[PDB]
Design a protein around this ligand. Structure first.
Ligand code: HEM
Ligand code: HEM
Lengths: 182, 182
């Protein structure tokens, strides 16, 4: 993925557990060569998955748990490293936000013009709840979507209850979630 | 499950959408031959599954969204229908309360001779985080655990974020939840 993402992980790790750690992880994930990530340059997803795996081992935490925290972080990190106005333009409620998210990523993608955004379709089951459809060219990131989702809860002082009901990894067509919100 | 599980479902639906809706929902579950649920009486689990499945059709929500709801509602309903004090006795805080859960359901089991209760194990990540291990003889109730915890959050004036990191029905040994709390 574009190196913003890996910068993102490096800085979450760095803020939380120090630099020492980041570097072991960066070494473990087999990436010591690279001296910094280039925010607007593209990488092989490999780079991102190995980072996550290293992080797990060094930190002794489930990969899934790091994805979840990473999803939460990103929401704050984007609003702060040059995308806060774009974020805000995507709306000021969670449901509105989730409808604008493909357009959000579309705006982004005309700058990062090699972007492989995900797709998100909402089916509202009420004014407090929906089925969310997560469609992706990649595997493994559902847990990120949950962190992401709780992060947007914070941003909007909204309380979000989230549960996966369908699973790409098992060969189903895409990930689906049921979401209850304040 | 024991009848009060079912009275509680009935109660919720009825309070939230009236008795015609509820009647309808009963009929659809193929339980017209039942004028009332007997709280302290053991029913086949089918009754409960059927009722949820039937209530998904009639309200146009997924089961899983209802289970989240039911999970929330259970917490209030029990404090009002004869288990207020057993609840208090379980603790003044969420972590504490979950730690006590196997102990609470044991106490319930005195009274409920053939109870088949869940088993909850807590690993404490931090003063404000836990891994919840949820183990069960039954399938499909993880969404409820999620609702349950939100109700507990409400009870103890505590904001909570629950993320399920592992899933009994893709073949994993048991549901594991990552949790973060005030
Ligand atoms: C300022 C806000 C955002 C920016 C700049 C942004 C940008 C990006 C970028 C650059 C990627 C990597 C795609 C690639 O390299 O091909 C990505 C992936 C992703 N973004 Fe965002 N994004 C933002 C907000 C969000 C939000 C709020 C969500 C909420 C769910 C989200 C969900 C995702 C997901 C799930 C992926 C994974 C890629 C995949 O599934 O294929 N993004 N985003
Ligand atoms: C006064 C409080 C509570 C009472 C009296 C109670 C009682 C029961 C009863 C009677 C059942 C049905 C079991 C059976 O029929 O064999 C049950 C199931 C369950 N209870 Fe509780 N419970 C209480 C609080 C909680 C809380 C706070 C949770 C939080 C997560 C919880 C989680 C569960 C779960 C997950 C089941 C599902 C059954 C299964 O997985 O096999 N309970 N409980």
């Amino acid at each position: 993925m574009y190196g913003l993402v890996n910068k993102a992980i490096q800085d979450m790790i760095s803020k939380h557990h120090g630099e020492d750690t980041w570097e072991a992880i960066k070494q473990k994930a087999g990436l010591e060569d690279i001296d910094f990530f280039v925010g607007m340059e593209a990488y092989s997803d490999d780079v991102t998955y190995h980072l996550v795996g290293a992080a797990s081992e060094v930190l002794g935490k489930p990969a899934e748990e790091l994805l979840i925290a990473f999803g939460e972080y990103w929401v704050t990190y984007t609003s702060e490293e040059g995308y806060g106005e774009l974020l805000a333009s995507a709306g000021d409620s969670l449901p509105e936000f989730m409808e604008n998210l493909d357009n959000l990523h579309a705006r982004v993608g005309l700058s990062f013009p090699q972007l492989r955004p995900p797709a998100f379709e909402c089916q509202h089951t009420s004014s407090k709840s929906m089925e969310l459809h997560y469609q992706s060219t990649r595997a493994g990131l559902a847990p990120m979507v949950l962190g992401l989702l709780h992060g947007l809860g914070k941003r909007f002082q909204t309380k979000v209850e989230v549960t996966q009901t369908a699973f790409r990894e098992t060969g189903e067509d895409h990930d689906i979630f049921s979401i209850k919100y304040e």
